[PDB]
Structures are given as structure tokens and as C-alpha cells.
Amino acid sequence: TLRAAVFDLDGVLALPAVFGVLGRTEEALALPRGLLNDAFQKGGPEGATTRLMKGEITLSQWIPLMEENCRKCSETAKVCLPKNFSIKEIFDKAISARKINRPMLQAALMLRKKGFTTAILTNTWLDDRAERDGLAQLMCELKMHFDFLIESCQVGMVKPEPQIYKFLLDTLKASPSEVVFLDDIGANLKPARDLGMVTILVQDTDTALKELEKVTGIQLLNTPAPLPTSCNPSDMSHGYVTVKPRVRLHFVELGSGPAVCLCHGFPESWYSWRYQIPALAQAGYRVLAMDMKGYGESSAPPEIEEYCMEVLCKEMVTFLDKLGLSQAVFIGHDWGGMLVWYMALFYPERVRAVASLNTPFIPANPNMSPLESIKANPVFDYQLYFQEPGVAEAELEQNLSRTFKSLFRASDESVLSMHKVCEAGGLFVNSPEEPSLSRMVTEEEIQFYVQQFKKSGFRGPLNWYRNMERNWKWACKSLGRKILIPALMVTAEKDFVLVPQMSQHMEDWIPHLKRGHIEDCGHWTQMDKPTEVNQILIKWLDSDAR
Amino acid sequence: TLRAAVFDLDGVLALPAVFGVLGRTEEALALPRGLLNDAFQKGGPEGATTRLMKGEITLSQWIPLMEENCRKCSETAKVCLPKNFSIKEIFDKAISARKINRPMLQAALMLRKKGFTTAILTNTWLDDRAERDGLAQLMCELKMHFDFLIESCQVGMVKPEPQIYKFLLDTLKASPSEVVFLDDIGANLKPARDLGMVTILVQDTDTALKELEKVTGIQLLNTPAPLPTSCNPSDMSHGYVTVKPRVRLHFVELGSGPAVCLCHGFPESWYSWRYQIPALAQAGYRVLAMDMKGYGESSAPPEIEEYCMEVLCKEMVTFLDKLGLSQAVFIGHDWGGMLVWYMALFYPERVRAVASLNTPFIPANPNMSPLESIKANPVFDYQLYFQEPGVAEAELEQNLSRTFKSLFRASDESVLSMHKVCEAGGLFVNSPEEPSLSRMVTEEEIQFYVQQFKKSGFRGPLNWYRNMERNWKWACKSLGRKILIPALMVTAEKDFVLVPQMSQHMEDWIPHLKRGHIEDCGHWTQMDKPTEVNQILIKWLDSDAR
Numbered sequence A, B: 001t002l003r004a005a006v007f008d009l010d011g012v013l014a015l016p017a018v019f020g021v022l023g024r025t026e027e028a029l030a031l032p033r034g035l036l037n038d039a040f041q042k043g044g045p046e047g048a049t050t051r052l053m054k055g056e057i058t059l060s061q062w063i064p065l066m067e068e069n070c071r072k073c074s075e076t077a078k079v080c081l082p083k084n085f086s087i088k089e090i091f092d093k094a095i096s097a098r099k100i101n102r103p104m105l106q107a108a109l110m111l112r113k114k115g116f117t118t119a120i121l122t123n124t125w126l127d128d129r130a131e132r133d134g135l136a137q138l139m140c141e142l143k144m145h146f147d148f149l150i151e152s153c154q155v156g157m158v159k160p161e162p163q164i165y166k167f168l169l170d171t172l173k174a175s176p177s178e179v180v181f182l183d184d185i186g187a188n189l190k191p192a193r194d195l196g197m198v199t200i201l202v203q204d205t206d207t208a209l210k211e212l213e214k215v216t217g218i219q220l221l222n223t224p225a226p227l228p229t230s231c232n233p234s235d236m237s238h239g240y241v242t243v244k245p246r247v248r249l250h251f252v253e254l255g256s257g258p259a260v261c262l263c264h265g266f267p268e269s270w271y272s273w274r275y276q277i278p279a280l281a282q283a284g285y286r287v288l289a290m291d292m293k294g295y296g297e298s299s300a301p302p303e304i305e306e307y308c309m310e311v312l313c314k315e316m317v318t319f320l321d322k323l324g325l326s327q328a329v330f331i332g333h334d335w336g337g338m339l340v341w342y343m344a345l346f347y348p349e350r351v352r353a354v355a356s357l358n359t360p361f362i363p364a365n366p367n368m369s370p371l372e373s374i375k376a377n378p379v380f381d382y383q384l385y386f387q388e389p390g391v392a393e394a395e396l397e398q399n400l401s402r403t404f405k406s407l408f409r410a411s412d413e414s415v416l417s418m419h420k421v422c423e424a425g426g427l428f429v430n431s432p433e434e435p436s437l438s439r440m441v442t443e444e445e446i447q448f449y450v451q452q453f454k455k456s457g458f459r460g461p462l463n464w465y466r467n468m469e470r471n472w473k474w475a476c477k478s479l480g481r482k483i484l485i486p487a488l489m490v491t492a493e494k495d496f497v498l499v500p501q502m503s504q505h506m507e508d509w510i511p512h513l514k515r516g517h518i519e520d521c522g523h524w525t526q527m528d529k530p531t532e533v534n535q536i537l538i539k540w541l542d543s544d545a546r
């Protein structure tokens, strides 16, 4: 029985195959059939190509050797190469045109999810071309999803040499009958088969996947849309910045490009952005996913005043100061969304662009205090329950697993009454002791929040709600201002704390405001609709944020 | 007696003054004298400009109000503004042309060095222009060098209102007689003087500095070339990446732009790059200063094999994998320099560009083992002393302060014989118990290395020398290759371990190699000649590394 799946790169995990471009060039240039392909494999195991694939020479050293082989091949066929013939130009284009074979990757991802050990086994070169980065990016995106990457130029061995197959077997710690091997070259498939491995000749993807699913007994074709790539906390780059003597800010960092600062809500973590971090980094951005003040590995001072908007925003500016960032795109959800609008109002020079998920921008009423404005419009009754220090902390910290299981639920899973909290005397009074697991989270993901919240508890997080009067007074200084930097407002149809209708007047204060809307989405936007969030954010970032 | 220096921004710390461009535009456009300047201050404390400087409105909201004032002013003077007149265009240009007043900053830096509390007090706006980043960058570079930055638009107060002066005094925790205040506007100087502060009207910088030095009794003018900005370890962003179960890599991170990975030598730290980190980040790069495996906050496994080049390079690739970086510019010194040439040979797709300080690239001799090649060319006798596990560790760890004080010395400070180590039986036998402090280091900088080396000691660092045969065998696989990506070789005239002559044949293996040379520079390149290093690296990075 199979427990390992091995995939080739060219013609298998990446399409169109770079090899097949030699034939395309022959047809386009009206050269004799197989001429370029013959010059490519000239000398067989002793030839320039084998030396390149073994890593004896780099791609740039190989280019003139292929050109020499091309001349010798044309000479025998009694023909001539065109005036502007360039091997570099042909391969630059072929490599650049080659993209991931998404359904093949999805199949590999499903097999690994079902307990398979996956590997990429490829005949490749040491790319030292001025344009090598495009390929470096392709390999990076691909490799992360597999247990192993065996490259011919790294191991000094090549397909179809039997050595590489024995090396693959040993890397896999598996006997050949436990291995399914997928390749587009029949010759490279032969030694794996001769060893006893299940082999698949890959021409079209669909047939190869039908063969793969028949042989593994796992559904891989026509299967539902998978969730975006998530984050394994121990495989992340963890950053720590001291913003003042008693305050340190923790963040997770992934990618290169314009800095994108992700700001979570209550009672969350940097981990609430797990489905956005890999997607945003893949889209060409440097993601900085925060543990906001009071949370996870960030400092949680006890004082209420340490959590007013003025202090939080000032510390985020200091955070940018110490990291050497003149700007960052600020993306917030919930209380993070509120922080991001205030960063745009008070520090526009430090905010490249501003985006909020669910949290609208509503200017302060200079006549009514928010301690009295609650309750007026809807019922923010739970906010009144959050005011008295120690009360909500006691209920929220009693059983952490129950707290996150009860709170982190989709719109059609509510076990919590949004309001009547200060009548019933608690958020969890009509809730079970052992809540069911929401379809949005695994048991493992709940236990990450449990472990995170064991360090500082709910005092710091609840203190974000305890500066109503302080925040209002500070917000009143910004009343004559408008947000004129690029801005995105993303509403969630079924968020009952933050109803889309609350955002309707925003264009009066942010005239050039751009929008997004997610249907059948509750309060926990990022984990409820990750695919939609990523497409709305990536589209807006590529259009409005460098 | 003075203990605090306060500087204005426009016309004082930054030149040319943005205010003086209104007059320049009047002259260029042949408009009535003072017209634009009058429209700018129209309404005095009730006018658009005061509201802007108090932070009631943003710069973009102000632009059309200034345009309206410009029309009203021209109407009274019975004149007309030109067809293509644009306030935004005028200010965009004025702000962009404004640069730091370097000698004024150097004076502020010298005063802070001599125990002064320094501050910037400025009348500024909330910049929400599409080009706001240029100003954000200016403020970032400037602010880091001062204890305080008081901005009118942040404090809701403006110069010359007496409130701001009382606010400044309170921020400073100082009585007005202890304060020297520098400004280009006589009116804004008046309330500070009326309070009892020493005031300086700044027209030309030189006179202002003569006045400043006479009043402080500190030499500020004609003073020597200062050292580049260094790093305070506690004000840095510290990053941690787990590359494998037992290995975590620590790094310091500063800046935005192309990733520049700094790799130290033996027995060093990320801190060996203290003078390069702020300079390189200022030059438009994202600096990642490593604690190499075996050092500081990075893991130090005991096994010798954990330190062979193959493993170290593979882990640096994994480091890039986990941070989401397809490439980084690799800059190494000493053993770090050796690592960087091997990264370029084995992983060219992951190396944007390669630079080495002192360490040359010399291909392996496939006939002679390096355990026998030592000694042949010079005398690498100390390397033989480093071989036996536990011996060099005992001497190097006995007294840490003595170790770093003895090793970290300029060319004309040697208390150490480079060789005859394995005859005399130790690196420190003819060295004092209490070495003098080298002119290259302060006592505080030595104590940072002491504290760093208290965690893991010298086992891991010395293990870099204990894989001679392993490294040679791996290097022999690269013998047919050439380094064809952008490369820089920087030689140090007085490095006696790495003599410039050792690098002479490099062009045979790196044909397009670029060079740098530092005269009167010993082995500790970065701290010996920081200014020269920064100019050679910045020049090469801007030319060859995106």
C-alpha cells in the first residue's frame, strides 16, 4: 500500500514544460524537426546538458555549449540557424512562461493531508542568469508544500541513472512498493518501475490524476475548492521590537515587497491572519502580522491607560521607527480596524494605504459621550459588561477552550446571544460547558489561542474597551479632517456586532473610499471567508498600494 | 548652565527652507513681492495655515484653501496668477528639494554625545499627499538622533503661542536657563527668549554653530569626521527563524527594499555590522544582520558536522525559505565571506549579488587536502591549534574580556603574534592579562561580545574550522563552475590573516568581479574603517544589486 507520492517538476508540477519549447522554436523558425532537441541531448551522459543537470557547470556556462551543439546539428542537417538566434532568449521566455500546474499541486496537497510523504524529484540546473529570480520564486512557492525537494544539480546525480532512485528511496525512508512516481518522460519513469514503484506517465493532467486517484483510493479530481495555505507557528520568522521600557511588540513576518501591517481584533492573535499571511506574501508583499498590545508574545501592561488609541497608535509609529519603515499598508479587523482608521487620521505620512475588515469609520459626536451613546443606535450591552476591571476577565479566563470554542463561530453556529449580557450576568450563561467545534476551526487551532492566552489572559485585551472617554476626546481633535490616502472598507453581511449598514456614511469622510463585501460572512471574517478576503485584499493592494 | 538643545526643522535641521520657496516662486513667476507669502499667512491665527499647523486639517484639505487665499491676494494687488499655477506642484517640489542640514545634525549629535537632551520643535502639517513618503523618510532619519520630536499638528499648539514653549519645557524636564533654542524665524524665537532661554537666530549655519559653540563651550564647528551611526542592541527589531528541530537563527533587521544578508566572521556577532546596519537601511535596503550558527542568540549545537559549509549554506537557504525571500544580497566578512562565495556557487538563484570583505575566493586543489595544505603558502598555524576539541575553547573562554580586548585591535595595536601559536602553546601566551582598550572599540562594545559569548562559548564558533576535509570535498564538486552573478571583493591592506595578494587570481573564476580596497585597514574591517566600508558597499549595491 502507497504512503509516498513523488512528482517531477517539468511537465508535471510546472506547465508548459520547458523541454517542449525546443520543438515550438523549431516549428516557429521552420528549422528541421528535432534539431534543437537533438543539440540539447548531444553527447548523452557525456554531453554539456548532463554536466549541467549534475551541477558540474551553471546555466550561463551551458548556454554557449548548447549554441555550439546547435551549429554542429544544423551543419549535419545541411541547414542554417536564423540571424537573431539566441538560446538565452529562448530559455528566458520558456522559464518565464512556465507556471505551477495548480490541479497537480492540489492533488499533492490532498495526498500530504491524507498522511502521504510527498517529494519533488527533478533534473534541474544551477541558474545564474540575470533573470534567475522568477525561477527562484517558482521553486519557493512549490517546495514549501512538499516534504522533500531532490534536485539533480544538488545531488550530482541525474534521471534516468539508477543511483538517484536509490537516493530518493533512502530520502523517503520507504520501500519502492509504497511509492507512486509521476513523470512526463517515459525513460525517466522506467527505473522507478523496474524497482517496483507505481509509475504514472503524465501527458494531460486529468488522466494522470484519474490514474493517481485509482491507485491511491483518494479523491483528487473534481474535489471541492481547498482553503488557502495556513501558517504553522513554529515555521514562521518571529520578530520582537521594544517600543518603550515596559512594552515589546511581537510579529510574524513573511515575504518581500511593500510592508503590510496586519492588525487583529478582540480577543485575537497574529494567527487570526493565518490564511492571509502566505497569500499576501505570495502576492508580492512583506507581511508583518502583529500580536497587538495585550496579546500573545506582545507585552500586556496592567494599566487601562496603556490601551487608549493615542498610546496604541504612537507605539505602532515607534514600531515602524525601530524597524526602519517610513510606511506600511495598515490592514485591521475589529479593534485592529478601529486602530487603522486612527493611524490614517493622525499619521497619514506613515500609512501607505488603509484597509478595514468589518470596522467602519464613524466620526465622534462631540456632544454625546460614548459611555452614554451606549446604548442608543443598537445595543452594545456587552461593552458595559467589559468596563468593570476583573469581571469579564474571570468569566473569559475560567475555561479558555470553552471561551474560544463559544466565540469563534460562523453566522449559522451561534450559541451566544449578542446582547442581554448585562441582565443574564455573563457572555456564557446560556452557553454549553463543552461547545461543539465550529466548522471554521480545528481543535489544534483553538488550542493555539488557549496557549497564547495563558501568558497574559484577558486584562490587556479587555483594556481596549476601557478607554471610551479618552478615545472620544482624542478622536474629537480629528473632526475637521478627512481620510484622503487610499482606503478600503470590507463589510461582512452577517456580522451582527458590525452590521454593513453602519458603514453607509463613510464616503462623507473618505470621499475616494473603495469597497468590498462578503456575503454569508460572520464577525470572524479572516477564517470565515479566507479565499474572498485574500482576493479582495490582493486586488486592492495591487491597484492602490504600490 | 545649558543641558538641552532644541532645534527647529525648516531652515534649521532641514535645507532649503520650504517657506523660502514662496518668494522663489514669486520671483520666477514675476508676481508682486510677498504675494504668495501673504496668502500663506492670511487670517493669522484664525487662517487656514494655523488650522493646518494645529492639525485641524490635513495638507490636502489645505491646498485649495491656500489657492483661494492666492486669488484674493492677487485681486487686491490688481494682478493675475499664471495659467498653470499649482500650489501642490510648488510644495511637492519644495518638500522634495528639502534635505537634512548635515553640519546642524552633526552639532546636535555632538551635543547629545556630551550629555545634552536634544529635541526638534517644529510647526508642521499632517501630510496626506500621494508623495508624503519622501517627508516620512526625512523625519525618520532625523528623529532617531534626538530625545524628542514635538510637532505642532500633533500637540494642537503652534509657534509663537506661549503654550508650546511651556509644553517643550515640561517635555524637557528643564528650566528655561538650561535650554538653547535655535530657529530661523525671529518671531518664533521671541517667546523662548522672553522665558529666559538662550536663543539663536539661524540664517547661515556656520554663524549659528559659532554662536552655539560659544554658548555651550563645546567644539561643534571644524570638528573631525564623526563615525557612522551605530546600533543600540535594545532598540533593534530582533528576528528568530527555526531552520530545523535543533537549530534557530537569530538576526537584527532594519530598513525596506532589497534584502541584504550580513554574515559575520570569527569570533564575532551581528553587532560587528553595527556601523553598516543604519547606513545600509538609510541607503534603501532591508538589512538582515545575522548571528551565524554557533553565535549569540542563534543555536549552537555541539557536533562538529553541524558546522561544515554544506550544512551552513543549506540552513541559510532554509532561512530565506521560512522568511519568504526568493533572494537576498549576501555580504560576508572572514568566515562569513567564505560562506557567501559558497552560497553564490551552490545557490546562485537565491543570491541577488555576493560581496566579501577580506575573504578571497580560492578554488579547492583536488590533489592536496587542506589538513596538509596547512602549512604551505603562508602559516595558518593557529588553525592547527583550533582543531583539537576543547583546547582553544579553554583559553578563549577563560577570560572573555581579555579574549575580545586582545583580538579586536587595529593594525598598529597588535599584542598578538599572528603565528607560532603551536610552539608557544596558545594565542594569548605573550599577551597581557589586562589588555589596553583598542581605539576601534569602547569598553561597552567589548562587554556586549562578553555577554553574547557567555551563552554558548567558543565550541560552535571553533567548529567552523573543524570541517576542513568535509568542506574541501564539497568545494571540489564546484570546480568546473564560475561565479557569474554580480560580485564584489573588498581587500584590507593590513589584514595579515587575509593579505590582499591572496585575491589576485579571482578574475579567473569570477570574470566580471568588481573590487574595493581599504588602506591602513586591519582584519576587523567593519569597525576599523566603517565610513569606507559603507561607501564601498552602498556604491556597489546601488550599481549592481537592484
Ligand SMILES: O=C(Nc1ccc2c(c1)-c1ccccc1S2(=O)=O)N1CCC(F)(F)CC1
Pocket: A265, A266, A267, A334, A335, A336, A337, A338, A359, A382, A407, A416, A417, A418, A419, A427, A497, A498
Ligand atoms: O466589541 C467589538 N467587537 C467584538 C469583538 C469580539 C466580540 C464581541 C465584539 C462580542 C460581542 C458580544 C458577545 C461576544 C462578543 S466577542 O467577545 O465574540 N467592537 C467594538 C469596537 C470596534 F468597533 F472597534 C470593533 C467592534
Ligand SMILES: O=C(Nc1ccc2c(c1)-c1ccccc1S2(=O)=O)N1CCC(F)(F)CC1
Pocket: B265, B266, B267, B334, B335, B336, B337, B338, B359, B382, B407, B416, B417, B418, B419, B427, B497, B498
Ligand atoms: O581564520 C580565519 N580568520 C581569523 C579570524 C579571527 C582570528 C584569526 C583568524 C586569528 C589568527 C591568528 C591569531 C588570532 C586570530 S583571531 O581569533 O583574531 N580565516 C580562515 C577562514 C576564512 F578564510 F574563511 C577567513 C579567514
